[PDB]
Design brief:
Layout (H helix, E strand, L loop, with lengths): L8 H11 L5 H15 L1 H5 L17 H14 L13 E2 L10 E4 L2 E4 L12 H4 L58 H4 L3
Antiparallel strand pairs: 1-2, 2-3
The structure holds one DNA strand.
Amino acid sequence: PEPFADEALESYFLRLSQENGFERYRIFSGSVQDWLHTTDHAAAGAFPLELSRLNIFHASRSSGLRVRALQLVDRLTDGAPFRLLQLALCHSAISFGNHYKAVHRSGVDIPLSFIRVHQIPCCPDCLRESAYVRQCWHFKPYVGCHRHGGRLIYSCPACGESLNYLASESINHCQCGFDLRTPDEIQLSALA
DNA sequence: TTACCTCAGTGCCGGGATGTGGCT
């Protein structure tokens, strides 16, 4: 699978597992963690399985060991040493005022508080063209979208069941639900 | 009743969370 220019790190990895047929939990644990362990023990010890936990700004001190795991993937998938690292969210070296935590992604630093940790929404009008969870949704200051007739990002309660893509890793549909093919200022607010 | 006998720091404080070691 090739990465998209605007793709989240977790989206790419989910697609990769699935592309190789590693659809189930047990093989997700396996095709990921056990292979890493058998390369070297450190690539696995630094690598918890749950998806939310995988990104750097969720991590503690042993980041370099997690990076080594990214580097093993870079070899396995015929990559480049920074192909994935250009996508990851890391600890900024810049305080952003009053000792706040701030998070750095290839040139843009966004304060910790604007990261939309829970209830990621989606836009069916773009998902039907290329189905992968995209970046710029994880931002708190971002409702609606550019293009697509505007309107609202279709929000978490799709059908009497809260949605996201991390506690339940499907893109087109989630849990009990279906394939989701379901006021004129926010399109300016959208430009983050 | 009586007689006898001695030398730019620092110091708490909450709270949700990352990670680990033992049992099955």
